Design a protein around this ligand. Structure first.
Ligand SMILES: O=c1cc(-c2ccccc2)oc2cc(O)c(O)c(O)c12
Ligand SMILES: [Zn+2]
Ligand SMILES: [Zn+2]
Lengths: 336, 344
């Protein structure tokens, strides 16, 4: 049924040319918001990270990250390995609550400046604000702190790309800044580590060979497998939207499992385009293994289990398991 | 006979460890940069990247002090492709003090650059020698020499003369080439036959990235199954020339050949042989022979394109006469036929 997979990839691509117009309508709104946010003292160093599509099957839905550079001191929240309070060694004295930078107050002023500027188009805390341009194009804007200091110790044994993309690349990436998005912690003044910029780099520079996918001899199917993985989750989440079991699952879980599959199979020849069918089947099978065993390490923070009982109930996992297994046993009817 | 080559590489490796001199240099270099950043004209001073233009003289170091010049326009000198006048699109400019007309005076900044160097070094013990591609030569303690070059940093698109250079697409990939060309380029003061206020394009930083990240596979030389001999071949090429230059120091025939010629020829060979399996360590002997052969082919045809500036022939007869090329040709040919006795 590999030809059906490529039938899916055929349609996912044709909608991209039909939405490159939508990305222009987003760039315009974003540039105006940054102009006025930069006028404010607290957001003077605002800028962009990475348009991107968390939901691939929703081409009119974009995700933008506004970055704000800060020299911080970080305090891990309750050994979460991923959530922190951000103390200091400043334009953000506004948002200090004791010695902690308040996500709530910083998020507040963030929204208000955008809600005021958008009146020139409505607004609806990972996704801080969500805009609706006209009535078809939506964009989720996430605020993020940028720190050009060395990465937190909870990242020391993550990003295991050495045998795939090389230890030299791992040192290169780990010299880049890391990011922090305001995110509730099961607490309201915590920040969660983000590496969306690193995720994009290794997604678009994904082969052991530097010339992977730049010639016919080295066409691999890494990218096609992840898109098919995202598309199947998104389709399953929409067929069962009014049952809510699949609501806690996101494309990030699929993206993480894919990075782990890349680590397990680091050779370009294990991703030959001729083998799209079995490559995707193996990708589904690993995700299923993460569901059954309830283990899905954050690719950058290995002690952070995305699939822990405290985050997703077993009944939700077993439901997605059964649905996916039914799809695989029937040549994925949900793809149409 | 590849084992004698390994004997050479064993020798070159031993003299690098006996890195302490490099620690002395970084000390004087950091004190020197501190004092130049105090001047309004050199506030953007910094380092680009130890560098050994002569692999057989570990005591001799080469350093580049870069200085960012925002929003410049270049004007090519006499269609040389490599030497330009530097003008600015604004004026506000800290280096306005060095304009002669609308062009930045290479000699006027070089004079102040040299004056600040000799002034600050006198407070330490090392002297400053005159060389103007390297502006100064620092003699540190017993026998450490430091050649200091200043270069302007421009973050604009690379000059059009480089449009079809850096042909690494089939080797290091088209996206690596795109990435490297988004990095800045550099301009060093250099006279052009002579015109006295020109600046020459420098890509020394791109040259380092490509040598230290040289494989088609990203894990090249990171494991035993992917050990290659690219870097060893260049070492052996630079060493062969430096030895032959020393033996013939009296005939003045080899005086215009430099490690840069070897380096450039090596890059063209890397383009010719993009696959890592053509550089297996088991074939060090054959791979070095191929490198020697290509450099000889450049010598006989009098054609060595600058790896970034394809229309600049480093082996032009205006630069090195035919006799010098044929002399060096015959010497290398003799060395190869006799298992390179100049290595002994
Ligand atoms: O970076 C260099 C560039 C050029 C060059 C020569 C002709 C046309 C364009 C560039 O020559 C050099 C000569 C050297 O001896 C050396 O150490 C160098 O680093 C360079
Ligand atoms: Zn690929
Ligand atoms: Zn190598």
């Amino acid at each position: 049924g590999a030809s059906k997979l490529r039938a899916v990839l055929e349609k996912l691509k044709l909608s991209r040319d039909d939405i490159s117009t939508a990305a222009g309508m987003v760039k315009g709104v974003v540039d105006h918001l940054l102009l006025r946010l930069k006028c404010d003292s607290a957001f003077r160093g605002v800028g962009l990270l990475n348009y991107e599509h968390v939901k691939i099957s929703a081409p009119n839905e974009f995700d933008v990250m506004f970055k704000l550079e800060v020299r911080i001191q970080l305090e891990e929240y309750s050994n979460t390995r991923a959530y922190y309070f951000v103390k200091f060694k400043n334009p953000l004295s506004q948002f200090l609550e004791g010695e902690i930078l308040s996500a709530s107050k910083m998020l507040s002023k963030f929204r208000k400046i955008i809600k005021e500027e958008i009146n020139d188009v409505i607004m609806k805390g990972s996704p801080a604000v969500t805009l609706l341009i006209s009535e078809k194009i939506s964009v989720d804007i996430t605020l993020a702190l940028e720190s050009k200091s060395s990465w937190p110790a909870s990242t020391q044994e993550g990003l295991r790309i050495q045998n795939w993309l090389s230890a030299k690349v791992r040192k290169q990436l780990r010299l880049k800044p890391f990011y922090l998005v305001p995110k509730h912690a099961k607490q309201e003044e915590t920040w969660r580590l983000s590496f969306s910029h690193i995720e994009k780099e290794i997604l678009n520079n994904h082969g052991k060979s530097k010339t992977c996918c730049e010639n016919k001899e080295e066409k691999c199917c890494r990218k096609d497998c992840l898109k098919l993985m995202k598309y199947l989750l998104e389709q399953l989440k929409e067929r069962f939207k009014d049952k809510k079991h699949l609501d806690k699952f996101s494309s990030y879980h699929v993206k993480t499992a894919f990075f782990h599959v890349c680590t397990q199979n680091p050779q370009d020849s294990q991703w030959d385009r001729k083998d799209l069918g079995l490559c995707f089947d193996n990708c589904v099978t690993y995700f299923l293994q993460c569901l059954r065993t309830e283990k899905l390490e954050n690719y950058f923070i290995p002690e952070f289990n995305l699939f822990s009982s405290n985050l997703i109930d077993k009944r939700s996992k077993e439901f997605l398991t059964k649905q996916i297994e039914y799809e695989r046993n029937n040549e994925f009817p949900v793809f149409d």
